[PDB]
Amino acid sequence: CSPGIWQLDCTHLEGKVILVAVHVASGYIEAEVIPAETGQETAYFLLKLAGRWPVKTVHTDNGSNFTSTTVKAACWWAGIKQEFGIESMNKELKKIIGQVRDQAEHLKTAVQMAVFIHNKKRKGGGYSAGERIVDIIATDIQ
Q: Which of residues 16-35 bind a copy of itself (CB under 8 A)?
A: 30, 32
User: CA–CA separation, 82 vs 111, rounded Å?
Assistant: 26
d(C-alpha 65, C-alpha 37), whole Å: 9
- At residue 68, the 3 state secondary structure works out as coil
CB of 65 to a copy of itself, least distance (A): 19
Residue 44 lies near a copy of itself (rule: CB under 8 A)? yes
User: Residue 104 Cβ, how far from ligand LF8 at the closest point, in Å?
Assistant: 4
Q: Which of 33-68 are b and which e, b meaning 16 or more Cβ less than 10 Å from the residue's Cβ?
A: bbeeebbebbbbbbbebbeebebeebbbeeeebbee
Q: Does 138 bind a copy of itself (CB under 8 A)?
A: yes
When the beta carbons of 63 and 95 are compared against a copy of itself, the nearer one is 95
Binding residues: 9, 61, 87
* Run of H or E residues at 85: none
CA distance 65 to 9: 8
Q: How many residues bind a copy of itself (CB under 8 A)?
A: 31
Contact status, residue 21 vs residue 10, Cβ threshold 8 Å: no
Interaction site with ligand LF8 (CB under 6 A): 40, 43-44, 47, 69-70, 73-74, 77, 103-106, 109, 113
Residues lying near a copy of itself in the complex (CB under 8 A):
30, 32, 44, 47-48, 50-54, 77-78, 103, 108-109, 112-113, 115-116, 119-120, 127, 130-131, 134-135, 137-139, 141-142
